[PDB]
Amino acid sequence: AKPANKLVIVTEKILLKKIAKIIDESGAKGYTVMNTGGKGSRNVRSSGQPNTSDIEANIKFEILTETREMAEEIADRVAVKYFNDYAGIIYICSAEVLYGHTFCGPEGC
Amino acid sequence: AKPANKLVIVTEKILLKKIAKIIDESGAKGYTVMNTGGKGSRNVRSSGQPNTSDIEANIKFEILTETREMAEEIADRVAVKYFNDYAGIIYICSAEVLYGHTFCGPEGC
Amino acid sequence: AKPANKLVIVTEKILLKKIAKIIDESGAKGYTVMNTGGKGSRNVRSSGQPNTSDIEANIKFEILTETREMAEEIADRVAVKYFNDYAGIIYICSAEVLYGHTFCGPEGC
Amino acid sequence: DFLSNFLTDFVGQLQSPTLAFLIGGMVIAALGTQLVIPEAISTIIVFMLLTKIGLTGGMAIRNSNLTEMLLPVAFSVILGILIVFIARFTLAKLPNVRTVDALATGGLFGAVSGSTMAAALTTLEESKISYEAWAGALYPFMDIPALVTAIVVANIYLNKRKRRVKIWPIIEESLQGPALSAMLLGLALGIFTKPESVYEGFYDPLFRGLLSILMLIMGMEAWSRIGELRKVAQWYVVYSLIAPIVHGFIAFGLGMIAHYATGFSLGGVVVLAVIAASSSDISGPPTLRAGIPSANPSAYIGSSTAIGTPIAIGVCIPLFIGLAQTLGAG
Amino acid sequence: DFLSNFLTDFVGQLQSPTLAFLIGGMVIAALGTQLVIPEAISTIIVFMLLTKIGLTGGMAIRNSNLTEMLLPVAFSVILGILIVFIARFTLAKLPNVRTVDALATGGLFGAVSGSTMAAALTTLEESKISYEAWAGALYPFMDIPALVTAIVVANIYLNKRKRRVKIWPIIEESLQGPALSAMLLGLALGIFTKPESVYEGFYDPLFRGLLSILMLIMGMEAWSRIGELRKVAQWYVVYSLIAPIVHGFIAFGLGMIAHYATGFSLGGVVVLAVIAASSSDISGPPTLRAGIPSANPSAYIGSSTAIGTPIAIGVCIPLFIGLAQTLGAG
Amino acid sequence: DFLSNFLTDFVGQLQSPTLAFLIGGMVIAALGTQLVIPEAISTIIVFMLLTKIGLTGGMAIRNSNLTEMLLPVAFSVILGILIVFIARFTLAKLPNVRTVDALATGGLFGAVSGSTMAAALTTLEESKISYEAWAGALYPFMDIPALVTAIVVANIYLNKRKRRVKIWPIIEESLQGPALSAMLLGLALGIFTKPESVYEGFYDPLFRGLLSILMLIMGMEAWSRIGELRKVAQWYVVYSLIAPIVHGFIAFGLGMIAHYATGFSLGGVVVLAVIAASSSDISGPPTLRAGIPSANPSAYIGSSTAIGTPIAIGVCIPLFIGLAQTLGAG
Numbered sequence A, B, C: 001a002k003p004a005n006k007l008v009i010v011t012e013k014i015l016l017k018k019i020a021k022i023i024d025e026s027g028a029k030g031y032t033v034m035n036t037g038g039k040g041s042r043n044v045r046s047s048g049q050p051n052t053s054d055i056e057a058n059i060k061f062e063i064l065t066e067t068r069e070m071a072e073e074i075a076d077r078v079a080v081k082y083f084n085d086y087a088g089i090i091y092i093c094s095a096e097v098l099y100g101h102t103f104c105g106p107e108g109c
Numbered sequence D, E, F: 001d002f003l004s005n006f007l008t009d010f011v012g013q014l015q016s017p018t019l020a021f022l023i024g025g026m027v028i029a030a031l032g033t034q035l036v037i038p039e040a041i042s043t044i045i046v047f048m049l050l051t052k053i054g055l056t057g058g059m060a061i062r063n064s065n066l067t068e069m070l071l072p073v074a075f076s077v078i079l080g081i082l083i084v085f086i087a088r089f090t091l092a093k094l095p096n097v098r099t100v101d102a103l104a105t106g107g108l109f110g111a112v113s114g115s116t117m118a119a120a121l122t123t124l125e126e127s128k129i130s131y132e133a134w135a136g137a138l139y140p141f142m143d144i145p146a147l148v149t150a151i152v153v154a155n156i157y158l159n160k161r162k163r164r165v166k167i168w169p170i171i172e173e174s175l176q177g178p179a180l181s182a183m184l185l186g187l188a189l190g191i192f193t194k195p196e197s198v199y200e201g202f203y204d205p206l207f208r209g210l211l212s213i214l215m216l217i218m219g220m221e222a223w224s225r226i227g228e229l230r231k232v233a234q235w236y237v238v239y240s241l242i243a244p245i246v247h248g249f250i251a252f253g254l255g256m257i258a259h260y261a262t263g264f265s266l267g268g269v270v271v272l273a274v275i276a277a278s279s280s281d282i283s284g285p286p287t288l289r290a291g292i293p294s295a296n297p298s299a300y301i302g303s304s305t306a307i308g309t310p311i312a313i314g315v316c317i318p319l320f321i322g323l324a325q326t327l328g329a330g
Ligand SMILES: Nc1ncnc2c1ncn2[C@@H]1O[C@H](COP(=O)(O)O)[C@@H](O)[C@H]1O
Pocket: A010, A011, A037, A038, A039, A040, A041, A042, A043, A058, A086, A087, A088, A089, B028, B029, B030, B031, B032, B033, B062, B063, B064, B065, B100, B101, B102, B103
């Protein structure tokens, strides 16, 4: 029962290497990535594979931070750098972490 | 910091074409799809591939709407049309969109 | 409009068989699984496939329970059994189920 | 004789591939293996088998007269409609069988398995029986009128019980399926082009080996659908055991009419009988789910996949091949 | 003559594989098929084709003199730079064409498609024209200086309009791509090792058949990118139709200089012309997206994939092969 | 002599496939390539190699006496138990080595790599040394008693330090693994059936080429596990370099007992030595993770994959093959 903020970044698949660098620079303890599909305004993709077989051409990042101010600092760094040229959405929900060794610490939560 | 509602539809994989049509008819700006697995009551599937290699036979839709009334209007249209015959669950959580061009607009959020 | 708790377990891919057993023992009506990637403290994996092609080596469970006390009882059983030796995080968010036959019942929600 | 010919043809096919990989996949799935064939490999195997069948059926069409393939195309359309009408009057008149479940089951048993059709062509080759090379192009002419008839007749019954359906979108979805589009691609490249160099080097030498992997998949499929068959009735077990044999015997009698009239060879009436004995399994149940959503999917998937496909490969292929050794001895 | 030779070479290649599977994939995608080739199969096919090209180009290098491959390597570097500079002064001087979109389009038309290069080697084999076996190793020497020149020149233009770029990380990303790493692996195993046993058994007999599946993929790719081409200009359609022919004619003239000076064979100047006519498709647009993020990706992906690759396979391959029947008749 | 024979056999195998693709995959992974082989392709390759080994080992069993394969089956069970007991008394008696990590490492070095066993059969073929065709069926008789012994002995040690384990579910999980189920399927189809037509057409001509892709994968695997080896000790590097050679020399001495008693051929004692030198890397670490969860997975995966498999393919295969040229010269 330790309160957290769940930041979600949905963007193009090509930015997997660059956004995982930004998360590791901000002091976040980890992240989770999925390959997803979806539709929006900038729907054209180029992933290095054939587009006709590229049904899931997005990534969904999921970052749990202890503070709200850290999760807005990752989102400000991603959206300034890439969201003028790449497709993307960033939203944040509120969660509570029950277990986890690097989040709650060795003391526990 | 623009408040939103996150509608989630988890259903069978065969309804990928029909549910993405309903979302685009309601005025939602976009959606996100994943291939997922899972267990429930109606566990039998038929996806057009061998069932023994079909470990992820569901879709998870994720739709962010500005209004609560729109997200309930997509859910009422899907559950009346398909949820008498197909497997499915629909839930809704609350989120806040920090960035995104077609959601927040060109003005910003 | 029936309130629920969304429990999320992110752990190693090898525990897919054992954690789905624990969820079915607790009285939860179902779950959802994804294959995900991600980074943390215990990053070494062994899934039975080559690690160089194993880009998504985690599972994300998603369990919707009616009561908060049930979702903490699944999380206490998983984290005591496996989280001393395996990688993992468990968090819980709050949701509202709009449709679903085994969750809301035949009466409706 | 007849049953003297059949039993040594039955153990003769168990002592061969294309049935042993069916049994071998069914045994290791019963023993609970974690061996899976990936879904990307299963998609490219069905593409490779059905393109090869299309390339031969079309390298022979441009030499053909297009009147020899008039009565087998007419008879395979009739067989697709008649099989659904047999299940309407026999299976649906049973105690705990819903009528909308029997019409969906008869629609799958009228449709064709490309896995069973490819297993019949390879057994005809190593039994040294000549067949018309365009006989694989009879596959859409039975598969599509059976799925259309099941959807049309069931939707009439649902409106009768309450007290119109668009036929062409059903034909459009069936033509655009991944199995049947690969054959039609092969048909067009056989007729209008000269694909003999890529056929003799790639699609023909890889046929029998890729089929043995698909025989392993269909059979791990069969064991995984047996649990769906415990939840419907015991009359779907009796239907799935004897209806592949009955539908093959009606097709063999219809094939002997074309043999006496246009010279349709005896190896081609075996292709017509096994095609009518097979039940979809993959491309069918997605079409019948959208067309008949009120049907219980444990009824028709459990009938056609768990029993109907091992019966058509295991029993019906050495039965109708051994029947064509009797006729054709003079 | 010349155009008497071309038209019977055009229908001669439509009556053959490697172009029919290109057209056949384009037709079934226009008819709206649900047939997809999985992404795991498309990755291992590009690996298998480019390893075979690398193994031959390197089993011939260790026998070579390394001065015969001095002017074709010098000319294919110049052609990669010149093609981007042609699109700077012709395509970007048009009314509704952005300059940063034309430099990204010219960077893709300077880069090489490995799918088009493999289609040119197989057509040279069954037209019985000998070529240098290391001519496939000219593929990185045009692909990489074209993508570097497009990123460098566009970043100079963006700083001019506002009122430095690291070149070696662009070369490092291009060398580490999955297509070009498979060829360099094959080059190294050809030179330093003796891979003749696995080459004659696996990589060579599976070449023409795996290419026909890749020809099916590239062509379902072409139809899916036509809708991106309605959103840019009508001058990208005129550019993508005639610039593969013009870039091939400049490369053919540069290849005839090497033919008269070092004995570079006429089958090798066809390889040099088709490589300069091809446009990248898969490995290029991810490099130009990171390098030039301000470019509209509907402009250069829609130009190079929807038109530029069917023109290079359909028109440019039987044009420059039929041109090398005229020269070489004495 | 002995070391005169070995060094020209060492460069003789580097100038050949099956080791060059191991080195070639290790070099391009060190240079940081983005080339990946998809997981669907890696699953069907292990299926194709182990089914072929099972089909030969079983087309020879039904001709065999079942007393020639009594002492090699007895000796390969003993070697699986003895290797884990060697690591208990040598590796675990070192300063910064945990005892529960050494028992998990010795369990992987007792288990067998099917990638290394397939590399030893192909090198014996092109060195023209005859071996017993059922020697591939010794693979479960060493793999399973080694993983059972590591789990049983480590769980005894954890209860000793605190102050019972079910053996048959460990054997049930190992028999149901995707690698070992493919071989047992091939064994059963070799004995009870006649699979010679699909074997000579599909599984045998595709063996050496599919192995060269698996040699590329194992080797990109080796470079990705070197970073796990910096976090344990420097004694896992010394163990992983010399224990594949020591376990092969104990197996070669045990194989020479069977050669002098039942006529077990000298090509079969090379198969017994390389199987005893290989470490699992694929099916092993998931079994030892569930059985011994308290072990550090960087210790035994980093030891067996980064060093132990390149040593067994690179050093141990040309050592024990060249040893069997010395014995067998009269
Ligand atoms: N309203 C929305 N709800 C959910 N996901 C969205 C929404 N808008 C955009 N996305 C996701 O964000 C990606 C990029 O959005 P866009 O910038 O509109 O192209 C899309 O492909 C979707 O995956």
